[PDB]
């Protein structure tokens, strides 16, 4: 409660923190008793001196660092859990103020310090009389009396006696009103004591069946999925340019290019070619950022939301209903196999230029040899060049959208072959991109050099005819939006190399373990199910196709892809179990293929993986 009358303020706010009174059984009474002890300590010291310095040091409720300093002087040392309350310079001894019930049953607590005892009605132990002065004893009398009157008046005699006898006891209390609030939404008390005999009932269950044959995934029906990635992929080409800087290459392209529309798409109108030509002209002049032209409204969707809202408001009819969304079901397109076969085609250069790490030990040499050989086998491939293009384009787009501009930024996609020549894959144009959150979409107008045009594969792309010098090239424009998170993720697209490298390294190290000798020239034969038959292919091209699949999965990642993979892990495990002549058993209502089929809706590579699974044997002997 509040401060007792006899205890003065200073001791009260000194004792407020010394101990956790609220968690003690009699914390208020315990605090009052400790305040009594501190007041007795202060009365014993008072205004007394020995050799010009105070005779007593009141260690109780004093800073521990100060106590240790004072003990460093005088050459004493006291543990913190048995620290005496007082130290007397006259006798060079330390005292502890103690309260007891009777003075007859008193013994020295310990040899470190002497005991000052009081029985709570004023009188003291004979040792206290032999030590303390008459005035000090009278003051202790006059405090313990008129503290006892407060004890009796509030009827705390038993609580005080309990506090004196034992030490502090921990507790935690919940009162009536909080208890009633707690009991509102349950059928039991605060401590649940249901009146039921413990028992485990016998419940009839269903029967466990066997998955004799592997599940057959569902192939969806509908229009084939168009290409819906940020960039072109396997159909990506570059224009060889004379050696120089990016500005020189862009000027060379812009000065000797004629552009005519071949195929026009309603999604990307042919009028947005003006934006790309203006960006090329500005970049050739040294300005990667240009002002806004009229076609930039359509190209980057400026003020599109505030027009669609008015269109919807004008076209308002009927009553409100819960918005049921739907995802169009699409079938496996023919272009996925073409993309896979084209991504593995060989290239002249290496396209993977990573600085080598240091080499100090033989383990480092082995690791760097493995990495070098993996780069050799997956470098001179089209998929590596496409990964490089994706990396450069995403990095340059990401690095230019933090500014929050109102103008159009141009980010050319240019590589260098090991001869100095500039390779122009295309350019990405960034709109105003007033981006608030990391998931916000930045408007883009991507131009890429196209190997071949397919309206079925690219319905939303506008394909233009591009002629430089005497060569013919195809240029594709697509209006697109793409978030900060996804652009940052694809700027680190080189991490797709890890998993094929993991597989290659595991195969090589397995061979090394078998023969107890590292050989980086191993190109073993890997048996696989191909066109529904068991033939084999070499390690190198198998790793190439794995890298192609991983790149396609990475650029086509979405909730369907991740759900499909997470639910095909179980079926892949089951298939591997059935290869080892193991039996697979399922609970009641177990349809593992349903978890996968829920995820096959319109993803081209999910469908490609599903068809690859379906062409495999479903029963093993």
């Amino acid at each position: 409660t509040d401060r007792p009358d006899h205890i003065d303020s200073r001791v009260w706010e000194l004792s407020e923190t010394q101990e956790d009174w609220i968690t003690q059984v009699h914390g208020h009474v315990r605090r009052v008793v400790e305040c009594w002890k501190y007041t007795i300590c202060c009365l014993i010291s008072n205004m007394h001196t020995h050799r010009g310095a105070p005779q007593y040091d009141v260690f109780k409720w004093q800073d521990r660092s100060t106590i240790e300093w004072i003990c460093s002087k005088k050459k004493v040392q006291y543990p913190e859990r048995d620290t005496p309350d007082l130290y007397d310079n006259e006798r060079a001894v330390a005292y502890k103020v103690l309260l007891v019930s009777d003075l007859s049953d008193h013994s020295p607590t310990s040899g470190i310090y002497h005991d000052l005892a009081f029985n709570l009605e004023g009188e003291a132990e004979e040792s206290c009389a032999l030590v303390l002065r008459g005035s000090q004893l009278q003051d202790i009398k006059g405090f313990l009396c008129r503290a006892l009157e407060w004890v009796v008046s509030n009827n705390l005699t038993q609580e005080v006696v309990e506090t004196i006898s034992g030490e502090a006891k921990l507790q935690f209390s919940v009162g009536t009103t909080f208890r009633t609030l707690l009991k509102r939404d349950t059928d039991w008390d605060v401590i649940p004591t249901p009146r039921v005999e413990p028992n485990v009932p016998r419940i009839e269950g269903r029967r466990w069946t066997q998955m004799k044959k592997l599940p057959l995934l569902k192939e969806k029906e509908g229009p084939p999925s168009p290409w819906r990635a940020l960039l072109l992929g396997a159909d990506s080409e570059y224009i060889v340019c004379p050696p120089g800087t990016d500005q020189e290459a862009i000027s060379w392209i812009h000065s000797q290019s004629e552009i005519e529309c071949i195929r026009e798409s309603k999604s990307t109108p042919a009028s947005v070619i003006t934006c790309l030509t203006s960006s090329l002209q500005s970049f050739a002049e040294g300005n990667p950022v240009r002002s806004r032209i009229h076609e930039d409204i359509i190209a980057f969707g400026i003020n599109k939301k505030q027009e669609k809202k008015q269109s919807a408001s004008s076209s308002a009819s009927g009553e409100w209903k819960r918005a049921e969304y739907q995802v169009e079901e699409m079938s496996l397109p023919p272009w996925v196999e073409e993309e896979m076969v084209l991504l593995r085609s060989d290239q002249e250069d290496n396209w993977i230029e990573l600085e080598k790490n240091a080499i100090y030990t033989e383990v480092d040499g082995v690791a760097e040899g493995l990495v070098d050989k993996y780069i050799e086998i997956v470098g001179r491939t089209k998929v590596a060049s496409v990964i490089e293009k994706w990396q450069i384009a995403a990095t340059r787009t990401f690095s230019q959208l933090h500014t929050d501009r109102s103008r159009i930024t141009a980010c050319p996609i240019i590589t260098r072959d090991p001869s100095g020549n500039c390779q122009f894959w295309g350019m990405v144009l960034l709109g105003p991109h007033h981006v608030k959150r990391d998931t916000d979409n930045a408007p883009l107008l991507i131009a890429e050099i196209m190997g071949e045009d397919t309206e079925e594969k690219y319905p939303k792309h506008s394909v233009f005819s591009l002629k430089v010098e005497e060569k013919q090239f195809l240029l594709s424009l697509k209006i697109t939006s793409f978030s900060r998170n996804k652009l940052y993720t694809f700027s680190n697209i080189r991490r797709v190399l890890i998993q094929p490298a993991s597989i290659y390294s595991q195969v090589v190290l397995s061979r090394a373990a078998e023969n107890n000798s590292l050989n980086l020239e191993v190109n073993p034969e890997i048996q696989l199910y191909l066109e529904g038959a068991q033939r084999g292919m070499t390690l190198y091209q198998w790793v190439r196709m794995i890298l192609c699949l991983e790149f396609l999965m990475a650029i086509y990642n979405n909730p369907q892809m991740e759900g499909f993979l997470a639910n095909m892990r179980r079926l892949h495990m089951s298939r591997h179990a059935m290869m080892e002549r193991r039996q697979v058993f399922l609970p009641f209502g177990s349809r593992p293929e349903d978890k996968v089929n829920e995820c096959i809706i319109n993803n081209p590579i999910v469908a490609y993986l599903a068809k690859g699974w379906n062409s495999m044997p479903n029963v093993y002997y």
């Binding site: 006291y78 913190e80 859990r81 383990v363 933090h402 990391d438 940052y488 090394a512 373990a513």
Partner: protein, 237 residues
Amino acid sequence: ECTLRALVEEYNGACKEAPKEMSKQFTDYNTFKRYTTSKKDHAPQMRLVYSVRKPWPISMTPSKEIPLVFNGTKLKDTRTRANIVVPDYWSKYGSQTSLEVVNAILYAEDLKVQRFFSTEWGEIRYGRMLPFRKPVQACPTIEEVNPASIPHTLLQVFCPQYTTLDSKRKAHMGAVEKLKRVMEPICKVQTQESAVHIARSLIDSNKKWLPTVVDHTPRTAEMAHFLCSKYHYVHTN
């Protein structure tokens, strides 16, 4: 003394400008030690490219040893903010320190380099070998120190005056004198938090889950990332 006067003036400033904060319990320091208004960034690596390329990326304490403009390049904003090339300038035209300070700062890190280069490597053996992970002491220490006594050992080295008898008692003696001798040039008001960090790592016996083909000594545990794997084992003499 200047140090005492500086401490007093800052203390009076805290009492005046932040009275309510000074009226809090001293144990509350464990709470407002990390009292930050800024929300946690789930993707801090995603801002590095922009942050490095901003004008004046680096925040610096005001000083005169760095020119405002160095060969047509403005180094500081004239707290004050520094150009990204300021650490590059300091690596060539900066103020030097004593060799003893360098040795103490590189201590517990120079030791790891010496241990790597003072050991000889056997031939790599490739085979079907199963790395099973157990918790072992990751890094060798100057003295073997029981955990939960590491903080008490640190108190004796750094602030032996601000400690109790029991904390003094439950402290590894022998490791205090080694730590005191090697940390002496950097046990000052500045780099006190750094010197504690090197002091911890010198006697920290934390256990980590590491691949094992044979039982790792503390020497081989810090190198378990290349000593063993699923397909190879390296013998250390």
